[PDB]
mmCIF file of C-alpha atoms in Angstrom:
data_model
loop_
_atom_site.group_PDB
_atom_site.id
_atom_site.type_symbol
_atom_site.label_atom_id
_atom_site.label_comp_id
_atom_site.label_asym_id
_atom_site.label_seq_id
_atom_site.Cartn_x
_atom_site.Cartn_y
_atom_site.Cartn_z
ATOM 1 C CA UNK A 784 -218.094 65.092 61.438
ATOM 2 C CA UNK A 785 -215.260 66.156 58.941
ATOM 3 C CA UNK A 786 -216.368 64.379 55.755
ATOM 4 C CA UNK A 787 -218.429 66.716 55.449
ATOM 5 C CA UNK A 788 -216.022 68.797 54.810
ATOM 6 C CA UNK A 789 -213.679 66.868 53.019
ATOM 7 C CA UNK A 790 -216.119 66.359 49.799
ATOM 8 C CA UNK A 791 -216.741 69.894 50.654
ATOM 9 C CA UNK A 792 -212.921 70.366 49.610
ATOM 10 C CA UNK A 793 -212.925 67.557 46.455
ATOM 11 C CA UNK A 794 -215.631 68.950 45.164
ATOM 12 C CA UNK A 795 -213.698 72.520 44.952
ATOM 13 C CA UNK A 796 -210.673 70.542 43.746
ATOM 14 C CA UNK A 797 -212.789 68.758 41.517
ATOM 15 C CA UNK A 798 -214.497 72.818 40.004
ATOM 16 C CA UNK A 799 -210.644 73.700 39.832
ATOM 17 C CA UNK A 800 -209.167 71.284 37.872
ATOM 18 C CA UNK A 801 -211.784 70.995 35.580
ATOM 19 C CA UNK A 802 -212.419 74.220 34.838
ATOM 20 C CA UNK A 803 -208.318 74.435 34.146
ATOM 21 C CA UNK A 804 -208.802 71.231 31.720
ATOM 22 C CA UNK A 805 -211.148 73.252 29.716
ATOM 23 C CA UNK A 806 -209.346 76.297 29.287
ATOM 24 C CA UNK A 807 -206.105 73.968 27.965
ATOM 25 C CA UNK A 808 -208.051 71.314 26.270
ATOM 26 C CA UNK A 809 -211.529 72.962 24.446
ATOM 27 C CA UNK A 810 -210.107 75.675 22.379
ATOM 28 C CA UNK A 811 -208.705 71.996 20.093
ATOM 29 C CA UNK A 812 -211.423 69.637 21.311
ATOM 30 C CA UNK A 813 -214.162 71.706 20.236
ATOM 31 C CA UNK A 814 -213.506 71.083 16.837
ATOM 32 C CA UNK A 815 -213.306 67.041 17.506
ATOM 33 C CA UNK A 816 -217.879 67.050 17.156
ATOM 34 C CA UNK A 817 -218.013 68.916 13.929
ATOM 35 C CA UNK A 818 -214.705 66.682 12.416
ATOM 36 C CA UNK A 819 -216.751 63.417 13.203
ATOM 37 C CA UNK A 820 -220.416 64.942 11.828
ATOM 38 C CA UNK A 821 -218.050 65.773 8.678
ATOM 39 C CA UNK A 822 -216.693 62.173 8.141
ATOM 40 C CA UNK A 823 -220.063 61.508 9.051
ATOM 41 C CA UNK A 824 -221.852 62.505 6.133
ATOM 42 C CA UNK A 825 -219.751 64.228 3.790
ATOM 43 C CA UNK A 826 -221.174 67.571 2.578
ATOM 44 C CA UNK A 827 -221.012 70.712 0.880
ATOM 45 C CA UNK A 828 -222.396 72.545 3.483
ATOM 46 C CA UNK A 829 -219.823 70.321 6.456
ATOM 47 C CA UNK A 830 -216.964 70.961 4.067
ATOM 48 C CA UNK A 831 -216.380 74.848 4.903
ATOM 49 C CA UNK A 832 -217.381 73.769 8.417
ATOM 50 C CA UNK A 833 -213.607 70.741 8.544
ATOM 51 C CA UNK A 834 -212.045 73.730 6.465
ATOM 52 C CA UNK A 835 -212.343 76.614 8.738
ATOM 53 C CA UNK A 836 -211.585 74.411 11.911
ATOM 54 C CA UNK A 837 -208.472 72.548 9.985
ATOM 55 C CA UNK A 838 -207.021 76.617 9.114
ATOM 56 C CA UNK A 839 -207.853 76.959 12.006
ATOM 57 C CA UNK A 840 -206.412 74.822 13.761
ATOM 58 C CA UNK A 841 -202.194 75.321 12.049
ATOM 59 C CA UNK A 842 -202.873 78.796 12.766
ATOM 60 C CA UNK A 843 -204.121 80.150 16.135
ATOM 61 C CA UNK A 844 -203.754 83.891 14.566
ATOM 62 C CA UNK A 845 -207.525 82.628 13.074
ATOM 63 C CA UNK A 846 -208.550 80.330 15.963
ATOM 64 C CA UNK A 847 -210.749 83.603 17.486
ATOM 65 C CA UNK A 848 -211.798 84.476 14.019
ATOM 66 C CA UNK A 849 -213.591 80.536 13.595
ATOM 67 C CA UNK A 850 -214.747 80.076 16.689
ATOM 68 C CA UNK A 851 -216.305 83.302 16.426
ATOM 69 C CA UNK A 852 -217.758 82.067 13.101
ATOM 70 C CA UNK A 853 -218.739 78.810 14.331
ATOM 71 C CA UNK A 854 -222.276 79.580 15.121
ATOM 72 C CA UNK A 855 -222.093 81.792 11.360
ATOM 73 C CA UNK A 856 -221.399 78.291 9.543
ATOM 74 C CA UNK A 857 -224.043 76.607 12.405
ATOM 75 C CA UNK A 858 -227.035 78.054 11.020
ATOM 76 C CA UNK A 859 -226.737 75.559 8.025
ATOM 77 C CA UNK A 860 -228.679 73.017 9.792
ATOM 78 C CA UNK A 861 -231.890 74.709 10.571
ATOM 79 C CA UNK A 862 -232.007 75.019 6.422
ATOM 80 C CA UNK A 863 -231.349 71.518 6.560
ATOM 81 C CA UNK A 864 -233.837 70.842 8.398
ATOM 82 C CA UNK A 865 -235.857 72.874 6.612
ATOM 83 C CA UNK A 866 -235.251 70.817 3.591
ATOM 84 C CA UNK B 924 -231.468 66.242 11.558
ATOM 85 C CA UNK B 925 -229.918 65.345 15.453
ATOM 86 C CA UNK B 926 -226.612 65.076 14.524
ATOM 87 C CA UNK B 927 -226.547 68.286 13.515
ATOM 88 C CA UNK B 928 -228.308 70.187 16.297
ATOM 89 C CA UNK B 929 -225.865 68.358 18.364
ATOM 90 C CA UNK B 930 -222.965 70.036 16.266
ATOM 91 C CA UNK B 931 -224.278 73.793 17.194
ATOM 92 C CA UNK B 932 -224.924 72.677 20.422
ATOM 93 C CA UNK B 933 -221.965 71.000 21.283
ATOM 94 C CA UNK B 934 -220.319 74.491 19.057
ATOM 95 C CA UNK B 935 -222.411 77.060 21.388
ATOM 96 C CA UNK B 936 -220.928 75.377 24.768
ATOM 97 C CA UNK B 937 -217.458 75.669 23.368
ATOM 98 C CA UNK B 938 -218.340 79.612 23.701
ATOM 99 C CA UNK B 939 -220.381 79.032 26.824
ATOM 100 C CA UNK B 940 -217.277 77.040 28.575
ATOM 101 C CA UNK B 941 -214.573 80.076 27.689
ATOM 102 C CA UNK B 942 -217.505 82.771 29.824
ATOM 103 C CA UNK B 943 -217.565 80.751 32.759
ATOM 104 C CA UNK B 944 -214.147 80.227 32.566
ATOM 105 C CA UNK B 945 -213.251 83.475 32.478
ATOM 106 C CA UNK B 946 -216.172 84.816 34.913
ATOM 107 C CA UNK B 947 -214.792 81.775 37.137
ATOM 108 C CA UNK B 948 -211.395 83.390 36.931
ATOM 109 C CA UNK B 949 -212.433 87.109 37.457
ATOM 110 C CA UNK B 950 -215.690 86.260 40.258
ATOM 111 C CA UNK B 951 -215.043 83.273 42.673
ATOM 112 C CA UNK B 967 -189.811 70.636 36.866
ATOM 113 C CA UNK B 968 -187.223 70.560 40.098
ATOM 114 C CA UNK B 969 -190.342 68.698 42.956
ATOM 115 C CA UNK B 970 -190.381 66.320 39.760
ATOM 116 C CA UNK B 971 -188.157 64.090 41.554
ATOM 117 C CA UNK B 972 -188.957 64.852 44.838
ATOM 118 C CA UNK B 973 -192.341 61.888 44.684
ATOM 119 C CA UNK B 974 -194.388 59.458 42.380
ATOM 120 C CA UNK B 975 -196.694 62.400 42.274
ATOM 121 C CA UNK B 976 -194.905 65.140 41.642
ATOM 122 C CA UNK B 977 -193.597 63.721 37.872
ATOM 123 C CA UNK B 978 -197.707 62.896 36.963
ATOM 124 C CA UNK B 979 -197.936 67.192 37.229
ATOM 125 C CA UNK B 980 -194.815 67.569 35.693
ATOM 126 C CA UNK B 981 -196.724 64.661 32.792
ATOM 127 C CA UNK B 982 -199.587 66.543 32.864
ATOM 128 C CA UNK B 983 -199.054 69.932 32.064
ATOM 129 C CA UNK B 984 -196.109 69.333 29.813
ATOM 130 C CA UNK B 985 -196.567 65.790 28.568
ATOM 131 C CA UNK B 986 -196.744 67.774 24.748
ATOM 132 C CA UNK B 987 -193.492 69.989 25.757
ATOM 133 C CA UNK B 988 -191.712 67.223 26.105
ATOM 134 C CA UNK B 989 -193.621 64.364 23.769
ATOM 135 C CA UNK B 990 -194.187 66.174 20.423
ATOM 136 C CA UNK B 991 -192.336 65.092 17.486
ATOM 137 C CA UNK B 992 -192.955 61.151 18.901
ATOM 138 C CA UNK B 993 -196.718 60.795 19.802
ATOM 139 C CA UNK B 994 -197.275 62.877 16.051
ATOM 140 C CA UNK B 995 -195.008 60.065 14.627
ATOM 141 C CA UNK B 996 -197.475 57.803 16.203
ATOM 142 C CA UNK B 997 -200.064 58.933 15.368
ATOM 143 C CA UNK B 998 -198.271 59.171 11.481
ATOM 144 C CA UNK B 999 -197.483 55.843 11.856
ATOM 145 C CA UNK B 1000 -200.934 55.116 13.344
ATOM 146 C CA UNK B 1001 -202.916 56.994 9.736
ATOM 147 C CA UNK B 1002 -199.746 54.829 7.596
ATOM 148 C CA UNK B 1003 -201.633 51.333 9.248
ATOM 149 C CA UNK B 1004 -205.243 52.599 9.081
ATOM 150 C CA UNK B 1005 -205.783 53.298 5.290
ATOM 151 C CA UNK B 1006 -202.862 51.665 3.245
ATOM 152 C CA UNK B 1007 -203.984 53.039 0.345
ATOM 153 C CA UNK B 1008 -202.756 55.347 -3.114
ATOM 154 C CA UNK B 1009 -202.738 58.739 -0.500
ATOM 155 C CA UNK B 1010 -201.362 58.435 2.355
ATOM 156 C CA UNK B 1011 -198.013 57.244 0.654
ATOM 157 C CA UNK B 1012 -197.343 61.097 0.517
ATOM 158 C CA UNK B 1013 -198.181 59.966 4.511
ATOM 159 C CA UNK B 1014 -195.216 58.043 4.566
ATOM 160 C CA UNK B 1015 -192.808 59.645 1.986
ATOM 161 C CA UNK B 1016 -193.270 62.555 3.933
ATOM 162 C CA UNK B 1017 -193.150 60.568 7.341
ATOM 163 C CA UNK B 1018 -189.414 60.000 6.285
ATOM 164 C CA UNK B 1019 -187.858 62.608 4.796
ATOM 165 C CA UNK B 1020 -188.892 64.812 8.626
ATOM 166 C CA UNK B 1021 -186.881 60.760 10.214
ATOM 167 C CA UNK B 1022 -183.673 61.105 7.887
ATOM 168 C CA UNK B 1023 -183.458 64.903 9.228
ATOM 169 C CA UNK B 1024 -183.914 63.162 12.626
ATOM 170 C CA UNK B 1025 -182.392 66.629 14.905
ATOM 171 C CA UNK B 1026 -184.455 68.305 15.936
ATOM 172 C CA UNK B 1027 -182.853 71.765 14.737
ATOM 173 C CA UNK B 1028 -184.064 70.169 11.114
ATOM 174 C CA UNK B 1029 -187.264 70.090 12.474
ATOM 175 C CA UNK B 1030 -187.474 73.106 13.054
ATOM 176 C CA UNK B 1031 -187.760 74.684 10.006
ATOM 177 C CA UNK B 1032 -189.572 72.041 8.830
ATOM 178 C CA UNK B 1033 -192.882 71.595 10.892
ATOM 179 C CA UNK B 1034 -194.049 75.099 9.311
ATOM 180 C CA UNK B 1035 -193.585 73.136 6.026
ATOM 181 C CA UNK B 1036 -194.554 70.390 7.210
ATOM 182 C CA UNK B 1037 -197.934 71.906 8.687
ATOM 183 C CA UNK B 1038 -198.771 73.890 5.265
ATOM 184 C CA UNK B 1039 -198.169 70.928 3.150
ATOM 185 C CA UNK B 1040 -200.404 68.677 5.779
ATOM 186 C CA UNK B 1041 -202.560 71.710 5.321
ATOM 187 C CA UNK B 1042 -202.464 71.981 0.942
ATOM 188 C CA UNK B 1043 -203.099 67.842 0.468
ATOM 189 C CA UNK B 1044 -206.063 67.546 3.252
ATOM 190 C CA UNK B 1045 -207.798 70.211 1.482
ATOM 191 C CA UNK B 1046 -207.668 68.282 -1.386
ATOM 192 C CA UNK B 1047 -208.397 65.181 -0.367
ATOM 193 C CA UNK B 1048 -211.108 66.803 1.243
ATOM 194 C CA UNK B 1049 -212.570 68.224 -2.285
ATOM 195 C CA UNK B 1050 -212.261 64.729 -3.951
ATOM 196 C CA UNK B 1051 -214.591 63.396 -1.589
ATOM 197 C CA UNK B 1052 -217.497 64.719 -2.749
ATOM 198 C CA UNK B 1053 -216.345 65.899 -6.708
ATOM 199 C CA UNK B 1072 -209.984 51.566 -14.352
ATOM 200 C CA UNK B 1073 -211.457 48.779 -11.795
ATOM 201 C CA UNK B 1074 -213.853 48.543 -8.722
ATOM 202 C CA UNK B 1075 -211.208 47.115 -7.165
ATOM 203 C CA UNK B 1076 -208.219 49.894 -7.656
ATOM 204 C CA UNK B 1077 -210.562 53.055 -8.212
ATOM 205 C CA UNK B 1078 -211.417 51.913 -4.300
ATOM 206 C CA UNK B 1079 -207.556 51.558 -3.211
ATOM 207 C CA UNK B 1080 -206.741 54.724 -5.090
ATOM 208 C CA UNK B 1081 -209.566 57.804 -4.341
ATOM 209 C CA UNK B 1082 -210.884 58.870 -8.257
ATOM 210 C CA UNK B 1083 -214.339 58.983 -8.948
ATOM 211 C CA UNK B 1089 -214.060 56.700 -2.567
ATOM 212 C CA UNK B 1090 -214.792 56.550 0.863
ATOM 213 C CA UNK B 1091 -213.734 59.047 3.069
ATOM 214 C CA UNK B 1092 -215.003 58.103 6.687
ATOM 215 C CA UNK B 1093 -210.907 56.489 7.606
ATOM 216 C CA UNK B 1094 -210.002 60.931 7.447
ATOM 217 C CA UNK B 1095 -211.178 60.515 11.042
ATOM 218 C CA UNK B 1096 -207.077 59.726 12.081
ATOM 219 C CA UNK B 1097 -205.548 62.614 8.817
ATOM 220 C CA UNK B 1098 -207.211 64.963 11.057
ATOM 221 C CA UNK B 1099 -206.223 64.119 14.003
ATOM 222 C CA UNK B 1100 -202.798 63.950 13.287
ATOM 223 C CA UNK B 1101 -203.634 67.264 11.747
ATOM 224 C CA UNK B 1102 -204.399 68.462 15.260
ATOM 225 C CA UNK B 1103 -201.793 66.900 17.201
ATOM 226 C CA UNK B 1104 -199.246 68.351 14.508
ATOM 227 C CA UNK B 1105 -200.538 71.635 14.346
ATOM 228 C CA UNK B 1106 -199.982 71.670 18.253
ATOM 229 C CA UNK B 1107 -196.841 70.311 17.673
ATOM 230 C CA UNK B 1108 -196.541 73.611 16.404
ATOM 231 C CA UNK B 1109 -197.943 75.767 18.614
ATOM 232 C CA UNK B 1110 -196.038 74.454 21.457
ATOM 233 C CA UNK B 1111 -193.300 74.693 19.746
ATOM 234 C CA UNK B 1112 -192.851 78.062 18.510
ATOM 235 C CA UNK B 1113 -193.976 79.437 21.888
ATOM 236 C CA UNK B 1114 -191.245 76.666 23.410
ATOM 237 C CA UNK B 1115 -192.695 77.671 27.150
ATOM 238 C CA UNK B 1116 -189.580 79.056 26.914
ATOM 239 C CA UNK B 1117 -189.592 79.877 31.341
ATOM 240 C CA UNK B 1118 -189.722 76.564 31.966
ATOM 241 C CA UNK B 1119 -187.851 73.727 29.409
ATOM 242 C CA UNK B 1120 -189.037 71.315 32.246
ATOM 243 C CA UNK B 1134 -170.705 67.327 30.919
ATOM 244 C CA UNK B 1135 -169.603 68.418 35.296
ATOM 245 C CA UNK B 1136 -172.303 67.263 36.673
ATOM 246 C CA UNK B 1137 -176.005 68.664 35.025
ATOM 247 C CA UNK B 1138 -177.664 65.551 36.179
ATOM 248 C CA UNK B 1139 -179.511 66.290 39.330
ATOM 249 C CA UNK B 1140 -180.489 63.746 41.304
ATOM 250 C CA UNK B 1141 -178.666 60.925 38.498
ATOM 251 C CA UNK B 1142 -178.434 57.816 41.613
ATOM 252 C CA UNK B 1143 -181.225 55.627 40.765
ATOM 253 C CA UNK B 1144 -179.245 52.504 41.217
ATOM 254 C CA UNK B 1145 -179.031 52.629 44.865
ATOM 255 C CA UNK B 1146 -182.579 53.406 44.617
ATOM 256 C CA UNK B 1147 -184.035 55.376 47.932
ATOM 257 C CA UNK B 1148 -187.425 55.729 46.708
ATOM 258 C CA UNK B 1149 -189.362 54.723 44.879
ATOM 259 C CA UNK B 1150 -189.450 57.239 42.534
ATOM 260 C CA UNK B 1151 -186.070 56.000 41.823
ATOM 261 C CA UNK B 1152 -186.785 52.473 42.052
ATOM 262 C CA UNK B 1153 -188.881 53.404 38.764
ATOM 263 C CA UNK B 1154 -186.612 55.786 37.053
ATOM 264 C CA UNK B 1155 -184.702 52.548 37.046
ATOM 265 C CA UNK B 1156 -186.622 50.038 36.020
ATOM 266 C CA UNK B 1157 -187.723 52.535 32.388
ATOM 267 C CA UNK B 1158 -183.831 53.770 31.736
ATOM 268 C CA UNK B 1159 -182.273 50.106 33.105
ATOM 269 C CA UNK B 1160 -184.716 46.996 32.080
ATOM 270 C CA UNK B 1161 -186.657 48.582 29.075
ATOM 271 C CA UNK B 1162 -183.876 48.064 26.463
ATOM 272 C CA UNK B 1163 -183.743 44.638 27.469
ATOM 273 C CA UNK B 1164 -187.801 44.734 26.863
ATOM 274 C CA UNK B 1165 -187.757 47.356 23.562
ATOM 275 C CA UNK B 1166 -185.482 43.316 22.364
ATOM 276 C CA UNK B 1167 -188.070 41.084 23.456
ATOM 277 C CA UNK B 1168 -190.832 43.478 21.309
ATOM 278 C CA UNK B 1169 -188.869 43.772 18.357
ATOM 279 C CA UNK B 1170 -188.644 39.353 18.313
ATOM 280 C CA UNK B 1171 -192.308 39.478 19.150
ATOM 281 C CA UNK B 1172 -192.875 41.958 16.458
ATOM 282 C CA UNK B 1173 -190.742 39.628 13.742
ATOM 283 C CA UNK B 1174 -192.337 36.439 15.422
ATOM 284 C CA UNK B 1175 -195.350 36.544 14.392
ATOM 285 C CA UNK B 1176 -196.221 38.481 11.813
ATOM 286 C CA UNK B 1177 -194.824 35.554 9.539
ATOM 287 C CA UNK B 1178 -194.686 38.014 6.067
ATOM 288 C CA UNK B 1179 -191.117 37.931 5.473
ATOM 289 C CA UNK B 1180 -189.944 41.582 7.638
ATOM 290 C CA UNK B 1181 -190.854 39.788 10.641
ATOM 291 C CA UNK B 1182 -187.551 37.423 9.625
ATOM 292 C CA UNK B 1183 -185.962 41.322 9.186
ATOM 293 C CA UNK B 1184 -186.919 41.285 12.664
ATOM 294 C CA UNK B 1185 -185.278 38.387 13.907
ATOM 295 C CA UNK B 1186 -181.829 39.264 12.743
ATOM 296 C CA UNK B 1187 -182.166 42.537 14.705
ATOM 297 C CA UNK B 1188 -183.139 41.056 17.821
ATOM 298 C CA UNK B 1189 -180.034 38.229 17.455
ATOM 299 C CA UNK B 1190 -177.858 41.187 17.385
ATOM 300 C CA UNK B 1191 -178.494 43.056 19.645
ATOM 301 C CA UNK B 1192 -178.779 40.465 22.178
ATOM 302 C CA UNK B 1193 -175.490 39.594 21.531
ATOM 303 C CA UNK B 1194 -174.224 43.808 21.621
ATOM 304 C CA UNK B 1195 -177.148 44.787 23.690
ATOM 305 C CA UNK B 1196 -174.751 44.827 26.758
ATOM 306 C CA UNK B 1197 -171.648 46.511 25.068
ATOM 307 C CA UNK B 1198 -173.800 48.271 22.985
ATOM 308 C CA UNK B 1199 -175.151 50.647 26.497
ATOM 309 C CA UNK B 1200 -171.267 50.490 27.161
ATOM 310 C CA UNK B 1201 -170.640 52.904 23.982
ATOM 311 C CA UNK B 1202 -171.405 56.768 24.307
ATOM 312 C CA UNK B 1203 -174.280 58.337 22.828
ATOM 313 C CA UNK B 1204 -173.039 58.719 19.062
ATOM 314 C CA UNK B 1205 -172.846 55.910 18.425
ATOM 315 C CA UNK B 1206 -175.593 54.244 20.246
ATOM 316 C CA UNK B 1207 -178.251 57.125 18.347
ATOM 317 C CA UNK B 1208 -176.592 56.016 14.534
ATOM 318 C CA UNK B 1209 -177.005 52.860 14.835
ATOM 319 C CA UNK B 1210 -180.446 53.326 16.751
ATOM 320 C CA UNK B 1211 -181.669 55.425 14.394
ATOM 321 C CA UNK B 1212 -180.149 52.329 11.293
ATOM 322 C CA UNK B 1213 -183.511 49.573 13.441
ATOM 323 C CA UNK B 1214 -185.773 53.009 13.749
ATOM 324 C CA UNK B 1215 -185.099 53.328 9.536
ATOM 325 C CA UNK B 1216 -185.294 49.597 9.005
ATOM 326 C CA UNK B 1217 -188.935 49.313 10.997
ATOM 327 C CA UNK B 1218 -190.347 52.722 8.650
ATOM 328 C CA UNK B 1219 -189.182 50.924 6.079
ATOM 329 C CA UNK B 1220 -190.781 47.802 7.047
ATOM 330 C CA UNK B 1221 -194.814 49.705 7.458
ATOM 331 C CA UNK B 1222 -194.378 51.584 4.838
ATOM 332 C CA UNK B 1223 -192.928 48.679 2.167
ATOM 333 C CA UNK B 1224 -195.860 47.282 3.927
ATOM 334 C CA UNK B 1225 -198.225 49.924 3.058
ATOM 335 C CA UNK B 1226 -196.732 49.317 -0.686
ATOM 336 C CA UNK B 1227 -197.400 46.303 -0.967
ATOM 337 C CA UNK B 1228 -201.032 46.788 0.412
ATOM 338 C CA UNK B 1229 -201.993 47.148 -4.352
ATOM 339 C CA UNK B 1230 -201.223 43.477 -4.300
ATOM 340 C CA UNK B 1231 -204.585 42.865 -1.789
ATOM 341 C CA UNK B 1232 -206.688 45.667 -5.582
ATOM 342 C CA UNK B 1233 -204.768 42.591 -8.030
ATOM 343 C CA UNK B 1234 -205.283 39.880 -6.077
ATOM 344 C CA UNK B 1243 -199.715 32.162 -5.251
ATOM 345 C CA UNK B 1244 -195.690 32.228 -3.641
ATOM 346 C CA UNK B 1245 -195.282 35.501 -3.490
ATOM 347 C CA UNK B 1246 -198.061 36.567 -1.256
ATOM 348 C CA UNK B 1247 -197.201 33.956 0.412
ATOM 349 C CA UNK B 1248 -193.928 34.949 1.019
ATOM 350 C CA UNK B 1249 -195.029 38.308 2.023
ATOM 351 C CA UNK B 1250 -198.408 37.534 3.964
ATOM 352 C CA UNK B 1251 -200.343 39.720 1.849
ATOM 353 C CA UNK B 1281 -200.016 46.877 15.083
ATOM 354 C CA UNK B 1282 -197.278 44.529 16.154
ATOM 355 C CA UNK B 1283 -194.365 45.837 13.731
ATOM 356 C CA UNK B 1284 -196.349 49.869 15.512
ATOM 357 C CA UNK B 1285 -195.247 48.747 18.825
ATOM 358 C CA UNK B 1286 -191.807 47.816 17.842
ATOM 359 C CA UNK B 1287 -191.936 51.995 16.804
ATOM 360 C CA UNK B 1288 -193.257 53.549 19.804
ATOM 361 C CA UNK B 1289 -191.415 51.475 22.055
ATOM 362 C CA UNK B 1290 -187.811 52.790 19.192
ATOM 363 C CA UNK B 1291 -188.774 56.020 19.857
ATOM 364 C CA UNK B 1292 -189.696 55.840 23.343
ATOM 365 C CA UNK B 1293 -184.989 53.939 23.730
ATOM 366 C CA UNK B 1294 -183.994 56.439 21.623
ATOM 367 C CA UNK B 1295 -185.639 60.369 23.846
ATOM 368 C CA UNK B 1296 -184.012 57.226 26.525
ATOM 369 C CA UNK B 1297 -180.814 57.615 24.963
ATOM 370 C CA UNK B 1298 -179.445 61.515 24.619
ATOM 371 C CA UNK B 1299 -181.456 61.973 27.932
ATOM 372 C CA UNK B 1300 -179.278 63.215 31.166
ATOM 373 C CA UNK B 1301 -180.875 60.489 33.194
ATOM 374 C CA UNK B 1302 -178.899 58.167 31.364
ATOM 375 C CA UNK B 1303 -175.740 59.449 31.761
ATOM 376 C CA UNK B 1304 -175.693 57.557 35.402
ATOM 377 C CA UNK B 1305 -176.539 54.202 34.348
ATOM 378 C CA UNK B 1306 -174.025 54.154 31.647
ATOM 379 C CA UNK B 1307 -171.523 55.541 34.201
ATOM 380 C CA UNK B 1308 -173.105 52.337 35.882
ATOM 381 C CA UNK B 1309 -172.183 49.662 33.559
ATOM 382 C CA UNK B 1310 -168.804 51.153 32.655
ATOM 383 C CA UNK B 1311 -167.845 50.482 36.672
ATOM 384 C CA UNK B 1312 -169.022 46.659 36.571
ATOM 385 C CA UNK B 1313 -167.214 46.134 32.833
ATOM 386 C CA UNK B 1314 -164.054 47.680 34.966
ATOM 387 C CA UNK B 1315 -165.082 45.786 38.124
ATOM 388 C CA UNK B 1316 -165.819 42.656 36.554
ATOM 389 C CA UNK B 1317 -162.098 40.910 37.132
ATOM 390 C CA UNK B 1318 -162.057 41.281 40.978
ATOM 391 C CA UNK B 1319 -165.905 39.003 41.047
ATOM 392 C CA UNK B 1320 -163.333 35.970 39.379
ATOM 393 C CA UNK B 1321 -160.833 36.743 42.161
ATOM 394 C CA UNK B 1322 -163.354 36.774 44.918
ATOM 395 C CA UNK B 1323 -164.768 33.075 43.623
ATOM 396 C CA UNK B 1324 -161.390 31.287 43.214
ATOM 397 C CA UNK B 1325 -161.097 32.467 46.944
ATOM 398 C CA UNK B 1326 -164.646 32.054 47.799
ATOM 399 C CA UNK B 1327 -164.083 27.624 45.932
ATOM 400 C CA UNK B 1328 -160.573 27.270 47.641
ATOM 401 C CA UNK B 1329 -162.460 27.766 51.148
ATOM 402 C CA UNK B 1330 -165.294 25.405 50.277
ATOM 403 C CA UNK B 1331 -162.627 22.994 49.292
ATOM 404 C CA UNK B 1332 -160.229 23.883 51.888
ATOM 405 C CA UNK B 1333 -163.737 22.994 54.557
ATOM 406 C CA UNK B 1334 -164.106 19.579 52.691
ATOM 407 C CA UNK B 1335 -160.171 18.464 52.771
ATOM 408 C CA UNK B 1336 -161.042 19.168 56.923
ATOM 409 C CA UNK B 1337 -163.715 17.533 57.201
ATOM 410 C CA UNK B 1338 -161.952 14.688 55.181
ATOM 411 C CA UNK B 1339 -159.339 14.691 56.845
ATOM 412 C CA UNK B 1340 -161.393 14.153 60.602
ATOM 413 C CA UNK B 1341 -163.617 11.279 59.655
ATOM 414 C CA UNK B 1342 -160.540 9.572 58.646
ATOM 415 C CA UNK B 1343 -158.885 9.173 61.619
ATOM 416 C CA UNK B 1344 -162.168 9.283 63.019
ATOM 417 C CA UNK B 1345 -161.871 5.573 61.540
ATOM 418 C CA UNK B 1346 -158.476 4.313 61.632
#
């Protein structure tokens, strides 16, 4: 009956809220895992990745540049795994 | 390496979520006072815009407490330098410099990690633990977001004749009014209990300072509220400064944990930070408009005090007359 419609409406509201929360918070929440990894094992490879997000957080102008360069910095993971 | 792989996966998912949100977009407060849910939505929407300075201060105190080393002493000194210019207009010019100094010192701090007794070299950072840097990174994140919001100002919202819209909490015609009065009037009388407990649970000789502060305010809080905002904020700044002095001094004396009788007993080498949280919250409450009405209520009670005495005398005389009447009736019965 109305239970299915209520569930569908709740799912739609949850999706809208999740999208809004992501669009509002992910720009800062992205660097959290990188910071946790950098603090987990301090290394020269992770230092540049940490510093990029550190400078990006203060100046939002370089934030899109840091988001673009995140993939370039992550390339060191394959080299570290191979070594 | 599973950790680096997961980090790269999260980095990719960061842009994946942005692309999905963009596709979902392309494809597919005035109401604050009405109900509690509306006010909760307001807090969800502009928590940072209102409470950024307090949150950054409390994260700073968090890192002070977590590290207790020599490097975070600069954190503490710059914290106090921020506090002494408490008014937000000075912070307006100091905050960009604050962020620049934070990033400048964090760069050196991170560089020092990778690269003269053992206890002292551990207490300092010279050739060096680095797990504690998570709190400092979180501080930088919060300060940067505060800088961003402050620069933006969200200028379209910014969410004494009569500016207070619905100040009349005192009559409590709605559940929201009940909560607002329980926060705006019966909370100072919980800041006092928090100060007392903070003093009396950490037995060091700074807690005795808290006991003096609680005993003083508790004898003069009821008349402190009657004062205008000027003296209130002055004395509350004094108490906040004493509390931050206590926490920074405890950070300093943490050095005495490396070079390690009666002195250590007498200085006893969290509770001194929850008091900071409540002090900042109450200092935000004071200057707010929604406290003017309760201050007016207290003024009204102070002026109305005299009437209650005459009312009570009337009640006593009524009871005395009643008992004289009943005694007279009984004695007439006996006669």
